[PDB]
Symmetry: C3
Subunit: 547 residues, 3 copies
Amino acid sequence: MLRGELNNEGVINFSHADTYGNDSVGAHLQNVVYPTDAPFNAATDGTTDTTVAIKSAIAHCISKGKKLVLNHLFMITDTLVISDGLHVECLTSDSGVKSDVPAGKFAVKITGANSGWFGGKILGKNLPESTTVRQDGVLFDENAEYCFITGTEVTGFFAKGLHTSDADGVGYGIYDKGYGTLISKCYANSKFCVALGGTEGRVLKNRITNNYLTSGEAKPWSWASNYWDGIVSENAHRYVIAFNDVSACGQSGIYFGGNGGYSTDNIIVNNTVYACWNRGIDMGLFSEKSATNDVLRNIIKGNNTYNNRENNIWLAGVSNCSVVGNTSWFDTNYDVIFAGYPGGHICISLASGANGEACVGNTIDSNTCIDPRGNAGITVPTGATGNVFGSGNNLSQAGAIYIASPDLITSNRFELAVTGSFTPVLLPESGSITLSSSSTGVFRATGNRIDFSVTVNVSSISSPSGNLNIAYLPGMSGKTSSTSMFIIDYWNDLTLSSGVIPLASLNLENQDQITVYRTDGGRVLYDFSSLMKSTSSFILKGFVDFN
Amino acid sequence: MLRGELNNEGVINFSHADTYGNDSVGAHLQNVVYPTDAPFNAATDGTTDTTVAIKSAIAHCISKGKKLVLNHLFMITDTLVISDGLHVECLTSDSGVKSDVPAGKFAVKITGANSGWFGGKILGKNLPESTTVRQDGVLFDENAEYCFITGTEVTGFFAKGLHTSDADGVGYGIYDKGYGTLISKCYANSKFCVALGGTEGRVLKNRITNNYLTSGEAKPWSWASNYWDGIVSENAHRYVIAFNDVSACGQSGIYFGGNGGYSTDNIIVNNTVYACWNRGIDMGLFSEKSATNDVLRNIIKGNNTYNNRENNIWLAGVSNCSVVGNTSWFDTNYDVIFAGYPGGHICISLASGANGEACVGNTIDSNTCIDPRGNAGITVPTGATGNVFGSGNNLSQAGAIYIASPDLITSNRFELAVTGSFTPVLLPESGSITLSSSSTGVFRATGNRIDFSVTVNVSSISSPSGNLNIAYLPGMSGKTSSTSMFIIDYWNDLTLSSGVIPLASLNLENQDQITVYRTDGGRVLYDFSSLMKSTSSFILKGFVDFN
Amino acid sequence: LRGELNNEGVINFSHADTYGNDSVGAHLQNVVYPTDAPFNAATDGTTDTTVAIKSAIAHCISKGKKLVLNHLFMITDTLVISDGLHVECLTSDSGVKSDVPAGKFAVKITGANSGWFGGKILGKNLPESTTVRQDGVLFDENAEYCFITGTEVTGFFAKGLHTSDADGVGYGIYDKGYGTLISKCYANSKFCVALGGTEGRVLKNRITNNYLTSGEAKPWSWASNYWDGIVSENAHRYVIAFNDVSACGQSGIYFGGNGGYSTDNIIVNNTVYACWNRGIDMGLFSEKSATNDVLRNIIKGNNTYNNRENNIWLAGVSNCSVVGNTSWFDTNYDVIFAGYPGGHICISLASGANGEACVGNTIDSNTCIDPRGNAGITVPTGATGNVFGSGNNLSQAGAIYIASPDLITSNRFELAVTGSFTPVLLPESGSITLSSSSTGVFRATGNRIDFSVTVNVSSISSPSGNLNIAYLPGMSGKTSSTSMFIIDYWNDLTLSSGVIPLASLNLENQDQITVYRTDGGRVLYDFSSLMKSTSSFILKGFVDFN
Ligand SMILES: C[C@@H]1O[C@@H](O)[C@H](O)[C@H](O)[C@H]1O[C@@H]1O[C@H](CO[C@H]2O[C@H](CO)[C@H](O)[C@H](O[C@@H]3O[C@@H](C)[C@H](O[C@@H]4O[C@H](CO[C@H]5O[C@H](CO)[C@H](O)[C@H](O)[C@H]5O)[C@@H](O)[C@H](O)[C@@H]4O)[C@@H](O)[C@H]3O)[C@H]2O)[C@@H](O)[C@H](O)[C@@H]1O
Ligand SMILES: C[C@@H]1O[C@@H](O)[C@H](O)[C@H](O)[C@H]1O[C@@H]1O[C@H](CO[C@H]2O[C@H](CO)[C@H](O)[C@H](O[C@@H]3O[C@@H](C)[C@H](O[C@@H]4O[C@H](CO[C@H]5O[C@H](CO)[C@H](O)[C@H](O)[C@H]5O)[C@@H](O)[C@H](O)[C@@H]4O)[C@@H](O)[C@H]3O)[C@H]2O)[C@@H](O)[C@H](O)[C@@H]1O
Ligand SMILES: C[C@@H]1O[C@@H](O)[C@H](O)[C@H](O)[C@H]1O[C@@H]1O[C@H](CO[C@H]2O[C@H](CO)[C@H](O)[C@H](O[C@@H]3O[C@@H](C)[C@H](O[C@@H]4O[C@H](CO[C@H]5O[C@H](CO)[C@H](O)[C@H](O)[C@H]5O)[C@@H](O)[C@H](O)[C@@H]4O)[C@@H](O)[C@H]3O)[C@H]2O)[C@@H](O)[C@H](O)[C@@H]1O
């Protein structure tokens, strides 16, 4: 009669296990599955284990192609596997899971095509002081394709002391090994907040920090800490990391290596990155370079990076990477939050890799560096080649660009100018000339042109005769030149007839020398060394355009 | 039996106030709450005040941890407060609230952690001509944390005439004083469409206009207008504002101050900003600079800005800001939409602040400026220091960069070149030498190099003798150089022995003077003044690398 | 009780019946499934459900309700989403499968704030078929701030070109609307996405038609079922950002230019690769007009690589910027394009197809990588007003290539260009002939050209009077603010003691340098008659040009 009909329509004894006809209420209801509904019957107290109920709800929802909505904060003790394009929706910002999952496994694993998680919380025990507790939050595994997590708070996954393998528990908040994984509008806060090891991910609009600063964990930092990087990337390819707020991390805010990883073609744009205990944006080789360990072709653009202890933007042994349009700065809050533990405090730094590998083919342009201590807003190490340092960089409010060696001026391109000095010597064809130490050389590199001023003051001679070159022009050794232009505009105490004047021209066999010579009517003569006394001076000016 | 059971299960007399067992149909339905359900029983006629019913629903959803969904457009007359992580979901794009909330309060105030509003509409009275009505739309308050409003039409909040305090009703569409607020995929149209006073907000992919151009409000614009900025920002920190379509505003498209405001570290990228009655993108100090009033370290990058009346991109008294890779332009639609009311029509302008504050340490590179009237693509005022104008800037389809005074070329760095002229004079060690007005000087500054050419045509003399200097080199007063090179490639009517040639070298004491001298065999002599007749001429050429 | 359970939607539940607000029935009427009464859509995925789904659509619009598609539903005519309706797919497997015929779309979206979340919109997917022609999702001219998000749109093809849109075109998603949002989608069809509206936003999509793995026979031709990832004509104020665009049968992202007036678009932070034409492609194929041009587009921060016929390509465009992009190749190029070589240039400027010049474009701060050592950037004859910035890094590719030395003064190369010329001498009377050993070198940096000239006479014919060296590349018809030349070497000239050669730019003919000499406290312009058949000198200096 009526009671029988109501049961037939899931109006009473409503279970998701039952078949109802499509015009029934029971059927309409079976489109949305709560784990509290029958036959899953999840607890709602948040203390009793719900792992079994939720796994069944998952598996049902996959089987019948229905939607899963988690309507409480549910305690679990084993990994939940979100697969087969199943979407876990959280009813509110307080729903999700709380994880007593054991070390060695994740709270949640997302895999398959187009699976993911909306909203809520995925919470670990949050005991960073504990010497036993080791957990991991969310994994997108190697099979994840266009999977996602959006709007979710993933916190409290720590693991004190470094793992030896993944089986130990690592302390990942979110670890992505998938293809095309979207992580957006999430809050992630764990030993390693977000770890990237996949391809074509998008990490957009997230808040990322493990708040080392306020943690209470004794300084100094060391490998035993429960507070590492905001983002840590190894074998990460073609990620975009945009619009994130990354601060106060135990190590670096956004890191790519370079340490058993081959990380290439990532784009890091329009992020704020600050107050980190290591580097802000950190691209670096710590393992030695190989076909399977490198950092290449990454674009760092339009970010605002400041007060990061050991440099805001740090490139070590990386190649073909671009740092364009970023504002990198410090203020006296640096001295407060890092009191006792002073860092390098550099806006933008290039350095060799751990095993000596050069920065090659990197492009640094249009950045605004502010360093009120006057540290060099950009630093360049010995060994670096093929890098371009554009003139659109503004270091007026920092120290000028610092280069570790003068040979860098011809082995890279400094459009942002570089100035230095050198001690000139003279090379007569025979005999010797010795120069007073009043004698100076100055040089400025601007792109592929170098300007030179050389003041030569002889202190003594010994039987100098024949041709004469000045030496040695910084950068120019083993280099050639398309054009060059030199004059002598002052001299004293030379043995010259009247209407004989000196002439100067780059030595085309050794283009780090300038040959000095003299007129003689309708020709010139290369006898200048015999016209020199122990009291002679001259001053030479000009420039070279090198190749 | 059956009646008593269906009542126990929520199948009849369904209410969210009842307790039901978890396998009941009632428990299932209670996961989602419509204010039309018992015990809220909101009116659906769109005309009856529902404030009380909706607030009950909201307090219930907070108490019990359930989803709220507005299923109609709902009249209200007091502020709805969305707190405690509650999300308001609008069932369709027609759902939401219509506000008759009175002056001094908002329609919707959002606060706490992870609270927000999806979809639908939030409509003011939309009476911009009214001299009485005053309303405010959505507020995120000082305790809002990672709250959001996404996908929502917020319109019609107006207030004719300026407010004296917030109590008066201001005419904000959306006003964010929160931390980490998201505003995305909204349409905001109100007197101040969007106001920013918080930290780490994300204003993404919105449509922003109060449609001044078609409003019918009588011109000229004045302080009494009901149409002000699209985005108005005071005390805004670490915002990213990206992908917005911003236009036709009564004042500026996107503005930061500087007028009761300490606005720093914001990123404005990839927006389109056009047809505004003040400026496109506007950063300036209207009130005096202080530790609590300033605009610092903002990034303006990749934007398309056009046909804004009083300039596309405007920087006034601001420091350490950048303007990189923007396309800024005008066409003949300027004079249609602004007929009768010409404004600056500059693509990128720097200015002093209102109280004369200098633009310091700004970076302008890689921008394309198109001005078919030939107005300077970029304008630099007197007082600006530490700024860098890159050579990546393309002003070929506009006027060339205009500087207010020549001394700017050595207090800033113009890689984008600046060319001018000056009248040379001769300073003899003794007597006087007077130049014809045919004598010319020209300088071109490129980065920290200035090239010069001077033509010296003497008109008279008065007992000249001793050394000679040409003066004064533009920009070079009180400056020093690391290298330079000058020659004299033409002379006429001078008192020179056979083989004696003129030499020229920068005065190292006063480095805006070029010392002119000549050869005497194996030394040189500084007696050029006396070698000079009243008909003497020479031409000097060279460059100075200044520090 | 049964009468009340009927009156409260607890029994015979239908969206047609009216219930009061406290009823269960009312609560359920907020969310509409087409499988619910009175629509009763089939669930087998093979029965046609058009009538059922359209009825549901009109209903949800009529009553202001939410429509959720809870299965994959076969259709045979266009579903029209209007009046602010959001279609919401219950899961990633729900949606529609289209056997709609040629000349119409599976789903059409229109009016204000209408859209589609999630699921699939799936075509016949028969790209080998010489009959089947379909189109996927249209936003028409009346779409206003509509959207599709979260959706897989695939399998819409049409072998052979259409004559009109009524033939069926092979579009995946086609946007003709204002302020359209296409995001988090997967689009894979003949033309994966097509753009012809205004102020659209195309964000974080995956876009490809997988030509490389298609098995369609090469070479490519107009008969192919694999064209562009993004095709734009009459496209204004789009942002295209965060997309993975790859392996397309024509270009990854294309604006024209071919019956299209496309302006003020921003293309940023996309990855673009392995396409069979160009990566990012902006050009005029039809002739330039007031309704056919491509203007003021921004290309910025992209990573483009191994695109067969050039990574970034501008042809006859104006006011466009290419800034901070990373453009590169590697040896995989030779693998995926074996038997079909292309240009293999990272960034190239060309004329439009009817000879139109690239005007007023901006190239700066790009990193180009080419192991073949092809020119990172190529500039054609005719280009005017372009600025190539010194922030570009080509150290790992070949240096910038210009087709003609004229370019150095009609554009601004801050990225320096070096070249050479044969000098001649131009004596006031007679003739001096130079050895072929004579050389002329130039480098242009900005609006400065630096020159080295070695002049080596081989024979004379009674020369006299003034002397000019000519012709300085680029300087024909130009003027200069400043110049500086010296002569630092000479042999075998007829010069008295204390007479040296001077040189200065010829101010009447500013591609010439006047050579002359000292004579006490004046100079004399008599140098031609001081030369012999074995005379030599070398001239150096620079011109700043206006
Ligand atoms: C700075 C001054 O400014 C003006 O006054 C003048 O220009 C003046 O000349 C000038 O001084 C010169 O500055 C040079 C040094 O520049 C500074 O910049 C460099 C980088 O270019 C350093 O940052 C330097 O700091 C010191 O050296 C570093 C190495 C120390 O940090 C340690 O780094 C370790 C390596 O780890 C990292 O690298 C790997 C890849 O290999 C991964 O990416 C990692 O993620 C990354 O962290 C790290 O393991 C250790 O724990 C340390 O953090 C740093 O402590 C400090 O000692 C900085 O001062 C100088 O060369 C010249 O001599 C002048 O002094
Ligand atoms: C431009 C031409 O190009 C070629 O032909 C040649 O190079 C030629 O030399 C050249 O001319 C010269 O260029 C200068 C012209 O300057 C133009 O650029 C400046 C800025 O650099 C101005 O835009 C100028 O316009 C005038 O001056 C401004 C100030 C007037 O606007 C008023 O501004 C008030 C303040 O408000 C704003 O500022 C505050 C902060 O202080 C906040 O940010 C606000 O939000 C912001 O709106 C405002 O209250 C008033 O209502 C006005 O809007 C403007 O009306 C106009 O008077 C423009 O011409 C010149 O220096 C030189 O003499 C040659 O003319
Ligand atoms: C490359 C070397 O590098 C260093 O070693 C040295 O510097 C050395 O000098 C150097 O050589 C020089 O390279 C010059 C440039 O050559 C290459 O770059 C150009 C562009 O700058 C070309 O890509 C060139 O390839 C040829 O010419 C093009 C036109 C051919 O492609 C065809 O394009 C047709 C039109 O379609 C396109 O344009 C329209 C707009 O009109 C739309 O945008 C379309 O979407 C777009 O596809 C197309 O229909 C046809 O199917 C073709 O694809 C190409 O086939 C090829 O012939 C490339 O080699 C060089 O000029 C100089 O001679 C030196 O050799």
